[PDB]
Design a protein around this motif. Structure first.
Motif, PDB file in Angstrom:
ATOM      1  N   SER B  78      29.084  70.876 -35.751  1.00 51.27           N
ATOM      2  CA  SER B  78      30.472  70.400 -35.620  1.00 51.27           C
ATOM      3  C   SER B  78      30.866  70.252 -34.153  1.00 51.27           C
ATOM      4  N   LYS B 240      34.139  66.504 -42.953  1.00 50.62           N
ATOM      5  CA  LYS B 240      34.922  66.056 -41.787  1.00 50.62           C
ATOM      6  C   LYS B 240      34.397  66.649 -40.469  1.00 50.62           C
ATOM      7  N   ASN B 241      34.505  65.893 -39.376  1.00 49.38           N
ATOM      8  CA  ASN B 241      34.160  66.306 -38.003  1.00 49.38           C
ATOM      9  C   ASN B 241      32.677  66.705 -37.786  1.00 49.38           C
ATOM     10  N   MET B 242      31.777  66.074 -38.541  1.00 49.12           N
ATOM     11  CA  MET B 242      30.318  66.258 -38.544  1.00 49.12           C
ATOM     12  C   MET B 242      29.644  65.754 -37.254  1.00 49.12           C
TER      13      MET B 242
END
Lengths: 268, 268, 268, 268, 268, 265, 268
Positions: B78, B240-242
Motif C-alpha cells: 500500500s 483500494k490504494n494498492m
C-alpha cells in the motif's frame, strides 16, 4: 555503388592471403526468390521473442522464439583479381547474389527448425481443404481454390511456390481442341498465375504447391553483420592458384499467422 | 547494505506512479544455494551458443543453445510503503528477495526446459547405476557409489543435493558399534559430508539425491541488468490504494558435460 | 587476475583471424595429478641430455636425450566472444586449466618415443615380481609387495596410480570379518593407501597398477613458453562457425632410474 | 555493553519515583521462540495496511490492517538497586530479556484481536483435515499428514509448535521390542522432527499442534521505540516496599496467507 | 635458498673448467638413515682423540682415535648446465643430497678401519648370544632377545637395522589362520617395531641384523668443510662429453661403548 | 645457546687443571613438564602432605634439595677446540642428564642423594574396576576415573614406548582405529590427555594422575659445568673429566591423586 | 601477573606476624564447577532482598532475604616463605584457587540456610516425579525424564550434577554384545550428556542427581572485597611451627524459581 565499395575495401584490407568487407545485409532496400515474397526486419539480438496468432475458421495468441542462423555461399576466382580492382568488382555481381539467394531459398521453404536449421514455411503451413475440389477442375483450378482458402485468415494471397516440372506441365496445358489454357506462346508474361507471382524453385518437391499471404503472415529478421571475405585456401576443389570469395549472412524467420499459408499436393 | 540502497533509490526516483532501482545482479560476490555450486559467467547477448561434450561409458561434441530466460517475483503493498524507508527495506529482503532465492533455486535444480523455464540440473543428469549396489548397503553407502560414478566423466564430485528430511536421516546415522558416521547435530549443522558441501533444499523432492562435478560440468550466465520496480495498480476492483513491488533477473544455464551430474533415489 | 589479463591481450592482439597471450608457465614450476608425484626442472633449451642409472637385480650407466614436446588442449566458444570481453574472461577459467592437466597426465603416464609423444612412465617401468604373492592375498596385499619391490632400487615409494574402478573396489573391500579393510567410504574419499598418496585416474587402464619413487626416479623439464591462443578454425571435423581457444605448453620428461617404478596387473 | 548503558541512564534519569532508558527493540539480528519462526519487519507508524491472499482448497486478494499493541514484562527488586549501580547491571540481564521473549510468545501464538491484544496464529489457522487419518496412525503420523496439508496453500512447512508433554511423548516413544523409534532423548534435546524446527512451548495447550509456512505466510512488525523503565509502585498488591524494573516493546503481526498454517488436536 | 646460493657461486667461480661452493656441511648444523640414529658433533681437526668405555659381564677407560675420511657422490649433466643458472638449480636438489645419504650409510654401517674407509658399526658390534634362543622362535623373537642383550651394557636400544627383505618378511608375517601377526602392510610402511625405529637399508646384508643404543654409544664427527664442485672429467670411462657435479664431506666415527651394539644373523 | 656460552667460558676460565661455568638453569614432553613449578633459595624445604580417606588428614614432610649429576671422560685437547667442547657439553653430556632427571622424578627413593619419585608415593590401581572383555585402553579409562576420588582431575598418562605402540595402533571390531593411525602414536594424546612415552617406565607399568596439582618441583637455580684434570686421568692416561649438574627437590602434596598399575596382559 | 602482585603486597604489608592483599572475586567478574552453571551478580550490601516465583505443576510470589556468608580455604607453608619472594609466588598458584572452587561448590550444592552456611540448590529443589519412569529405562533414561520435568517451570535445562561413580557407571555402560551403549571413555572424558554439560563432583551424594535451568533460576551475589592473608597460627591440633596462607570471599545465593531445579535418586 555496392560492388565498388566492396572491391575497394577488399583490396585495402588484403594482407597477401586474407581480405574482408562489412557488407551490412545483401538485401536491396533494407525470377523472384522466396525471400522477395516475405516481409523484412532488422535486429541487434541473436534471439527474437514474438507473439503468434492462431485463427479458428476467432483469434488466440502464444509466445514463440526464433534464433538467428548463418547462411553462406562461395565462388572461386583467378588470383589475378585483388590487384586489378575492376576485375574484383566484376565478380561481386548478380551471380554471387543469386547463389546466396538460392541458398536461403532452401532454408526458408523447407527447414525443420531443430539444430542448425531455420523454421520453414512448409513446416508451419495449413493443409489444403480438399472439400473445395469439383468435377472438371484442372491443376490451375486447384491453385484458384487455394488462393480463396488463404482469405479465411483476414489476409490475402501474394505469391505461389511450385516445382519447375509442375509449372512446366501447368503452363503448356491444353484444351480439348488443341489450344493452350493460358493462351498461346506469344501471350502470357512469364511467372504469373491469377495475377500473383510464381516462384518455380528446386526446393519445392514435385507434386507440392504452397500459396499464402507472405508479405503479411511471415517476416525475415536480418541480424545485419553480413560479410564478404577472400582467401588463398587449401581444399579438394581445384585450388591450384586461386582465391575463394565467401559471403555469409545471419537470419531468422518469424511466422505470425500460419493459417495464411496453405500447403497442398496435386491429386495426379 | 543492498536492501538499504534499493529502498533509498526506490523513494528517490518515485513519481506518483512509478519508481526503479537498477541492480547489477542479485548474486552476492559476482547454507549454500544451488547457484553457489555452479560456475559463473557474464554476457551481453540474448542467447549463448556452446559445445556440449558426450563421454562414452573418445569424446563426442554437439552444438547447443541457451536462451537468457527471466526469473521474477512480486508483492502487493500500500502507498504507506513509499512514505517509510524502514518499511520498504522490510519488503526488499524479508518478502521479495527471500521469495526470489527459492524461485531461482527451483529453476536451476528442476526446470523442465520448455517455454519460459531454464533447463535444470535434474533434467540433464545421468541416472545412478544401481548395479554398483552391494549387500547390506545404507543410504550413506549409496552416496559413496554415486561419488565414484561421477569420476567416469573425468571430473571429481564437488557437492551433494538432498531434501532437508533426508539430510537429517543421513547426518544422525550410526555404524553398528554405536558411533556416528559423520557426527552428531554438529554434522547436521555445518553442512559437510566427507569433505563435500551439502545443499539441503525444499526444491529436491524427498527420496531423490543429486551429486556432481558442478563447478566444472555447468555454468550460469547472467545478463547483468536486474531491476527492482514499484508501480501503482490502476486495476482497483475491491482493493483500494494498492501498490505492486517487483524484482527480476535474466539468466541462462549451460551444461558442458552431463555425465558429470548423477541423479538417483534412495529405495525408502 | 590471469583471466582478466589474458582477455585484455587476446582482444588487443586480435587480427580478425588469430590472437595470442604469453603465460610464463601456467602453474607447475612457480585429487593430485601425475605431475604432482614427479620432480620439477626449468630449461631454456629445446633438447637436453642426461645419464640413466641401471641397477642390477651394481650400477651401470647410459646416455639419453630428451626432446621438449608440445602438450595442448582447446575449447570451442561462439564467434561473439571476441566482441564482449567479460564473455572472454568467462571462458579463460579453471575448466580450461584442468583440461590441460588431464591432457599431460595422459602423455606422462602412457606416451611413447615416436612423433610428438613424451616417453611415458608405463613404458620405462619394470615388471611386478609375482614370486612375492602369498596365499589368500587381495588386490590390496599385491600393492604392499610392489611397495617392497621399489626398495630394490635404493629408493622408497612415494605414491600409487590406479584406475577409479580399481580404487573403488579396493577402498570399499570387506575383510573376512564382514567389515571394511581401509575404513569405509571415508577412505575412498581422501585418497591414501598405507600413508602413500593414491592418484586415481581415467588415464590408467582397468586392472593395471603403477607404484614408484616418482620424485627420485624421474623429472619433468619445463621450457616455459606457454600460450593462450584464439582462432577462427574448422578442423578435426567437429563443429562449424565456432571460435577455438587453445592453451598449450612445452615439456620434456627424464627417467634417471627406471628400476624405481613398478608396473603390474591384478589377476583378481 | 547494553546492561552498562541501561544502568547509567536509569540512575542519571531517576528522580524520586521514576526513571527511563530508550532502546531500539530487544530483538537481536534485526530452543527457538515463536518470533524466531516468523519473518521480521521495521515500521514508523502505529497502524499497517496489508494485502492477504486466499487459496481455494485459485488466488484472490483482500485488504487487512494490523494495529501496534504493547507487550511488557516486569521484575521486582529492593530499592537499594537505585543507590548501587553494579546491582542494577546485575538485574538488567538475560533473565529479564528471556521473560519478555516468553511474554510475547503467548500473544503471537494464542492472542485474540480484541482490545490491547495481537491476533495470534492459532486464530487464523486452517483446521486440520482429519479425513487424512487412518486407524493405526501415531501422533507423529498425524503431524506428517498436517505437513502434507500445508502444501495446498502452495507454501511448504518451516516449523512445528507443540506442548512439552506432547513433544516428550513423540520423541521418547518406545517400540514393542523396547527400542526408541523417533530418535531417543537426543531428539527431545536439540529440537528437530523430520529436519524442521520444533518449538516446544507451554503457551501451546496440551493435545494441540500447529504447523505452517511461518517463514513466508506471516511477519512481525516492530515499532522500535522500546523502553526499560524503573518505578516506585504498589500495584498487583503482592510485595510491599519494592522497586519495579519493566521492559516493554510495541509490535504488530500481519498474516499474508492463513491457508498455510494448519491447527489440529491429537487422538490421545 | 641453498640451491640459489650454490648455483650462483658455481657460475661466478666457473672459469671454463672448475667451479666451487662452500656448503658448511649438508643440513647437519644440528625413512630414517644410520646417521639419524647416531649422535652428532663438530670438529676443527682431522685426527681426533677420544676415551672408550669397557664393561665387565665397573667401567674401565681407554684411549682411542678416529681419522676424518672423505665421502663423495656425483651426478653427470649436459654441458649447457653451466650456461643456464635455472638449469643448474634443477640439478642442485634433493636427489643430489639423498645420494650422499646412501653413500655415507654404507661407510657408517659396514666400513673397515683400513684405507680410505670409516671403521663401521658392524666391526665394533658385540656378537648376539645364541643361548637366548628358544624352540620355534620367529625372527622378531630373535630381535627381542637382542634388544634385551643391549641392557647388559647398562644402556637400552634406540633403533634396529635390517635388510628390506628381512623387514618385509617380519612385518607382512601371516599366520596359518590367514591373517597378519605383526600389523601387516601398515606396520611395514612408516617403520616402527616395538616402539623403536627400524632403518631398512641395502647396506645391511640379507639374513643379518644390528640393534643398539646408537644415540648414546656412538657419535659422527663432522669437520665442517664440505663442498659442492663442478668439473669437465673422464675418470671411470663411463660417459663422454659430459659435465660432472660433485658433493663431498669429511666425517669421523667415535664409538664410546661397543657393548651397547649387538650384531647377529637369523635362524630361518 | 647454553653450550655456546659454556664452551667459551670453560676455555677462558681454564688454567691448566680447573675450569668452571655456572648458570640459572640449563633450559615429546618430559615427566618434569607434567608437574607444577617452584623457585627456592634454600637447600631444604618444609611442606604439609594431605592424606584423603577413600575426610582429610595432614602430616609434616621435608623436600631436601639433591644434585642430579652426569660426567664424561675426554682427551685434554677438547680444551683447544671450542666447537668440539660444545659438542661434548650438549650431545654427550646434556642429553644424558635429561635422561637421568627423568628416572629420578619417575622412580627414585627418599634414601641417600636420591629424590623420592612419583611411582614410590603413588597409590595402587583398583583391579575391581575391570569389567569382562576390557582392553588395555579400557584399563586406562578406569584409572582416569580413580584419580577423581582424590578431588583432583587426571592430567597425563606415563607409558613405556612398547605399551604406547600397542595402545595407539589398536582397532575395534569394525576394523576402525580407536585413536587413529600415525596421528595416534605421533602427536602423543589419549582422550585429550598428554601421553609421556619414556624409557624410565617399566614395560607393562602405567601411571596416571593430577600431576600439575598433586606435586611440585622446587628448583634451586645454580646448575653448573666443571672440567677436572686432577687424578690418574692425567698422570698416566692424559685424560680429563667433564661434569655437569643441577639441584632439585620434589614435594608430593596429595599422593591419592597419582595411580600406579600394571596391565592385565 | 596475579601471583606477582599478591606476593609483592604480602611481603610489603607483613610486619611481624600477619600480612594481607586485597582482591576482587578471584576472577569470576574481573571440568565445570557448580559456580560456572549459575548467573553472576555484584553487590555493595551485606544483605540482599528479592522476590521468589512459585508455579503450579498462575505465578505466585513471596519476598525473601539472603545474607552474605564467608567461604575460606587455607594452605600451610614453612616460615621461610616470607623471606624469599619467589618461594611465596610459588605458593600463590592454581592449587590454592582450585581449593577455593571446591570449597564454594560444597556450600552452593548441599548447604542449609542455618548458621554460617548458604541455602544450597539441593534444599530448595523440586522432587523428581517418578510417574514419568517407563519399563526398561536405564539410569541415563531417568535423567532424560528429569530434563523434561524442568520445562514445566517455563525454563529449559542447562546442566546436570552427578557423583563421579555414577557418571563412570553411566558413560562406561556395556551392552549384552560387549560394546558401549552411551559411547565409552571418550564420553567420560569431555563431560557432555545429550549436549548438556555434566558436573561430576564429590559434593554430590552417590545415587543422587540434580538437573535444572541453573543459569535462569539462581544467582550468586558477590560482595567484592576478597582477601589473600598470611598468619602465624596453631589450631585444630594437626600441625605445629608452620605458617598459614588463607584466601576468602563473601557470597550470597538467591533462588528466584525453585521449580526449575529437579532433585532425585537412582533406583539401584
Amino acid at each position: 555503388s555496392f560492388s565498388e565499395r566492396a572491391a575497394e575495401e577488399l583490396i585495402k584490407s588484403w594482407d597477401g592471403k586474407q581480405g574482408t568487407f562489412g557488407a551490412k545485409t545483401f538485401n536491396k532496400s533494407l525470377r523472384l526468390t522466396i525471400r522477395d515474397l516475405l516481409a523484412q526486419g532488422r535486429t541487434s539480438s541473436n534471439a527474437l521473442e514474438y507473439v503468434r496468432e492462431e485463427v479458428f475458421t476467432d483469434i488466440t495468441f502464444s509466445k514463440q522464439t526464433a534464433n538467428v542462423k548463418t547462411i553462406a555461399h562461395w565462388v572461386q576466382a583467378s588470383r589475378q583479381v585483388m590487384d586489378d580492382a575492376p576485375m574484383l568488382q566484376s565478380y561481386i555481381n548478380n551471380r554471387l547474389m543469386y547463389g546466396l539467394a538460392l541458398k536461403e531459398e532452401g532454408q526458408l521453404l523447407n527447414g525443420d527448425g531443430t539444430g542448425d536449421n531455420l523454421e520453414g514455411l512448409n513446416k508451419v503451413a495449413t493443409a489444403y481443404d480438399t472439400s473445395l475440389n469439383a468435377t472438371g477442375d484442372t491443376r490451375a483450378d486447384i491453385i484458384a481454390h487455394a488462393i480463396y482458402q488463404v482469405t479465411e485468415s483476414e489476409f490475402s494471397a501474394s505469391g505461389i511456390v511450385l516445382n519447375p516440372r509442375d509449372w512446366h506441365n501447368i503452363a503448356l496445358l491444353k484444351d480439348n481442341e488443341g489450344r493452350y489454357i493460358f493462351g498461346g506462346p506469344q501471350a502470357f508474361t512469364s511467372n504469373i498465375m491469377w495475377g500473383l507471382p510464381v516462384v518455380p524453385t528446386k526446393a519445392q518437391a514435385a507434386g507440392t504447391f504452397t500459396v499464402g499471404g507472405f508479405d503479411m503472415a511471415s517476416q525475415v529478421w536480418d541480424r545485419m553483420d553480413a560479410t564478404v571475405e577472400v582467401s588463398r585456401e587449401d581444399r579438394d576443389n581445384f585450388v591450384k592458384n586461386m582465391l575463394t570469395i565467401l559471403c555469409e549472412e545471419r537470419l531468422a524467420l518469424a511466422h505470425y499467422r500460419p493459417t495464411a499459408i496453405i500447403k497442398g499436393t496435386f491429386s495426379s
